[PDB]
Design an enzyme around this catalytic site. Structure first.
Site: not given
Ligand SMILES: Cc1cc2nc3c(=O)[nH]c(=O)nc-3n(C[C@H](O)[C@H](O)[C@H](O)COP(=O)(O)OP(=O)(O)OC[C@H]3O[C@@H](n4cnc5c(N)ncnc54)[C@H](O)[C@@H]3O)c2cc1C
Length: 295
Positions: A71, A253, A293
């Site tokens: 994040y 970003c 990013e």
């Molecule tokens: C460098 C970096 C910075 C980041 N900064 C932030 C930030 O500041 N704020 C923020 O909120 N997030 C940020 N993110 C994204 C964050 O890391 C997580 O990926 C995000 O919160 C989603 O993770 P989760 O645990 O909610 O989902 P997971 O539980 O991992 O679920 C995600 C998975 O479900 C599927 N999926 C996701 N979206 C969809 C869709 N629309 N349709 C279908 N399938 C889908 C994919 O298989 C994905 O791998 C950042 C990511 C990176 C790489």
């Protein structure tokens, strides 16, 4: 110099949640929370533009422990209270369509974070990243193109540049350049940190310009919903003119698809002067002045 990986997944820093507040106002779409964590008891330090990892509890569908999710840090190195004791995040609760096993799907780590209660302990790793760092030169120009939570690293830059308490704490960085934020969100209530962003523009009209792309409230010249790429096209000549300065840095970003439209817009602008943007951009990246990013 630049702090990095002071804590790793095998031995994370156990911080405590101080606050969890909503950023999407009434009438907005989705949930995005500003979460602040207490760093006292550990030595985690960081700077603007970096990210931290959060390891959510529980196991995945395969029974294995959940891995960290990154994040972007939402606070400056000093924390929102400028006391060097906290760190903040800007987290959107991930939720999507039905055609993904079941009916409604909620992201694991983001749902854990957006619903976390003050006082709870959280596993933190990092900081990580050297791709989105702000220059130390107070005369640099900074272009910020953000979509949704992409606003996060931009908040760290703008707060360090313009918050009264930050300027008082950073005698070595009294910003006097020009910064321009082009921010795309679906609605006005979805303009994260709206009040503070507009406050900064009112106080520093010659050092900060704020441009919004609000999809559900504005239409581009083609009649389609207004997106960041449309605003970049609209102001392509102005942006290209700023980019030509050896001291200008650009930060992008947000969603991965945002890059294509931005490049097409700048390419048309640069071409007017006989410059091929894709090539000029390669040099900017090599010089460390084109920061991206997306996720
Ligand atoms: C460098 C970096 C910075 C980041 N900064 C932030 C930030 O500041 N704020 C923020 O909120 N997030 C940020 N993110 C994204 C964050 O890391 C997580 O990926 C995000 O919160 C989603 O993770 P989760 O645990 O909610 O989902 P997971 O539980 O991992 O679920 C995600 C998975 O479900 C599927 N999926 C996701 N979206 C969809 C869709 N629309 N349709 C279908 N399938 C889908 C994919 O298989 C994905 O791998 C950042 C990511 C990176 C790489």
């Amino acid at each position: 110099d630049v702090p990095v990986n002071l804590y790793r997944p095998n031995a994370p820093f156990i911080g405590k949640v101080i606050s969890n507040e909503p950023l999407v106002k009434e009438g907005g779409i989705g949930i995005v929370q500003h979460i602040k964590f207490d760093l006292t008891g550990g030595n985690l330090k960081y700077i603007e533009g970096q990210s931290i990892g959060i390891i959510p509890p529980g196991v995945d569908k395969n029974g294995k422990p959940e891995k960290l999710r990154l994040y972007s840090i939402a606070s400056t190195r000093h924390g929102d209270d400028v006391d060097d004791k906290t760190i903040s995040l800007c987290v959107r609760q991930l939720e999507y369509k039905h055609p993904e096993s079941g009916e409604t799907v909620y992201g694991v780590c983001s749902t854990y974070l957006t619903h976390i209660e003050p006082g709870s302990e959280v596993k933190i790793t990092g900081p990580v990243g050297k791709e989105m760092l702000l220059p130390d030169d107070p005369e640099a120009n900074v272009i910020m193109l953000a979509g949704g939570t992409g606003i996060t690293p931009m908040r760290t830059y703008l707060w360090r540049m313009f918050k009264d308490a930050e300027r008082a704490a950073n005698p070595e960085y009294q910003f006097k350049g020009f910064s321009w934020l082009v921010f795309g969100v679906p609605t006005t209530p979805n303009i994260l940190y709206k009040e503070e962003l507009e406050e900064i523009q009112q106080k520093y009209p010659d050092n900060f310009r704020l441009t919004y792309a609000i999809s559900r409230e504005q239409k581009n010249p083609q009649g389609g919903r207004m997106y960041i790429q449309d605003r970049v096209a609209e102001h392509a000549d102005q942006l290209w003119q700023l980019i030509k300065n050896q001291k200008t840095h650009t930060y992008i970003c947000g969603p991965p698809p945002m890059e294509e439209g931005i490049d097409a817009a700048l390419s048309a602008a640069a071409a007017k002067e006989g410059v091929t943007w894709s090539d000029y951009q390669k040099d900017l990246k090599k010089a460390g002045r084109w920061h991206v990013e997306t996720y």
